[PDB]
Amino acid sequence: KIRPECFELLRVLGKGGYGKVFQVRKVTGANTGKIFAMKVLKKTKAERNILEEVKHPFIVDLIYAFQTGGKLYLILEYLSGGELFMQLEREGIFMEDTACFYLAEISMALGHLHQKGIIYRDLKPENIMLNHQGHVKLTDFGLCKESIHDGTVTHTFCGTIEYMAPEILMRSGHNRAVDWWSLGALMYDMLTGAPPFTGENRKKTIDKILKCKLNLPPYLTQEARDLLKKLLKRNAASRLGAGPGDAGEVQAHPFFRHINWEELLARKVEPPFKPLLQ
Ligand SMILES: C1=C(c2c[nH]c3ccccc23)CCN(c2ncnc3[nH]ncc23)C1
Ligand SMILES: [Zn+2]
C-alpha cells in the first residue's frame, strides 16, 4: 500500500495554483532509494486517466497514483533533463538536424496520443521535457501550471497562447489537427528564435494568429519551409497530419528524410544534447 510517507521530499520542481511537483525518494519497498517526481493536486481526473492509458517512450510514465486527504498524488518518472525550452534558450536557434530530432520524437508521441483519442493542444517548449539521455518526454496533461488565471473558469488563455491553433482560441470546436499546428509553431520557434505569430499585447497576438499570415524566413531549407507551410494553416482539415495518416503524413515529409523511425523510437538515435554532460 502506497502513501505519502513512503516518499521523502528532496526539492520543489514546480508549483502552480492547482498543484505542486517534488523530486522525491522512495524509502520503502523494493524501489527503496528510487527517485521519482511527485505531483500533488488539491482536489485532475482526465490527467490521471490519460497517464494510466498511455505508454510510449516519449511520454512520461506514471508509476503510482493515490489519494489521501483531499490531495491526489501522482508518482511519475523523474526527468532530470529539464525543459526543451532551456536548450532552445541556451542555443538561441536550433540547427535543423537539432530541431528535426526533437520534432521527430514529438511527432511519434503525438501519433500515440491520437490513436488513443488524446489531444496535447500546447507544444510550447516549457511543456516538453527531456529525460536523462536527452530524449523527449511529453509531460503536460494537467489543468494549468500558472499562478494567475485568465478568466475565472476555463484555463486556455492562462499562459502563452503563442503555440495554440486558431480554432482553440476561437473555441469553435477542434480535433487532433490542433496538435500538428502546435508542432509547426514549435518548429518555427526552434528554427527562427521566436513563435510564428506574436503581438505587442494579448489582443494583437490573437489577431495575428487568427489572420495566420505566415512569414517564412528565406534562410531555412526548402524542406523546412514546405513543412511549416503545411502545418501552420488556418484551415485545420488541410494541415499535414490532419488527414487519415495522422503522424504518418508528417513523418513522411522530406524534412524528416534522414530519420530511421525504428531507431528513433528505440532511442538508439543520439540526442543532439546530453543533459548529463552539461
Ligand atoms: C515542471 C512541472 C511544473 C512546473 N510548474 C508546475 C505547476 C503545477 C504543476 C506542475 C508544474 C511539472 C513537470 N516537471 C517534471 N520534472 C521532472 N520530472 C518529471 N516527471 N513528470 C513531470 C516532471 C517539472
Ligand atoms: Zn489557469
From Swiss-Prot:
Domain Protein kinase: 7-256
Keywords assigned by UniProt, alphabetized: Acetylation, Apoptosis, ATP-binding, Cell cycle, Cytoplasm, Kinase, Membrane, Mitochondrion, Mitochondrion outer membrane, Nucleotide-binding, Nucleus, Phosphoprotein, Serine/threonine-protein kinase, Synapse, Synaptosome, Transferase, Translation regulation
Activity control note: Activation requires multiple phosphorylation events on serine/threonine residues.
Record PTM Phosphothreonine, positions in chain: 156
Entry PTM: The phosphorylation at this site is maintained by an agonist-dependent autophosphorylation mechanism. Activated by phosphorylation at Thr-156 by PDPK1.
Enzyme class label: transferase
Distribution of this protein across tissues and organs: Widely expressed.
Example of a GO biological process term: G1/S transition of mitotic cell cycle
Catalysis performed (reactions): L-seryl-[protein] + ATP = O-phospho-L-seryl-[protein] + ADP + H(+); L-threonyl-[protein] + ATP = O-phospho-L-threonyl-[protein] + ADP + H(+)
Active site: 122
Cysteines engaged in disulfide bonds, as pairs: none
EC number(s) given by UniProt: 2.7.11.1
Protein's cellular compartments: Synapse, Synaptosome; Mitochondrion outer membrane; Mitochondrion
Example of a GO MF term: protein kinase activity
Keyword flag Kinase: yes
Primary localization: other
Domain remarks in the Swiss-Prot or TrEMBL record: The autoinhibitory domain is believed to block phosphorylation within the AGC-kinase C-terminal domain and the activation loop. The TOS (TOR signaling) motif is essential for activation by mTORC1.
Family: Belongs to the protein kinase superfamily. AGC Ser/Thr protein kinase family. S6 kinase subfamily.
Function description: Serine/threonine-protein kinase that acts downstream of mTOR signaling in response to growth factors and nutrients to promote cell proliferation, cell growth and cell cycle progression. Regulates protein synthesis through phosphorylation of EIF4B, RPS6 and EEF2K, and contributes to cell survival by repressing the pro-apoptotic function of BAD. Under conditions of nutrient depletion, the inactive form associates with the EIF3 translation initiation complex.
Subunit description: Interacts with PPP1R9A/neurabin-1. Interacts with RPTOR. Interacts with IRS1. Interacts with EIF3B and EIF3C. Interacts with TRAF4. Interacts with POLDIP3. Interacts (via N-terminus) with IER5.
Protein name: Ribosomal protein S6 kinase beta-1
Native species: Homo sapiens
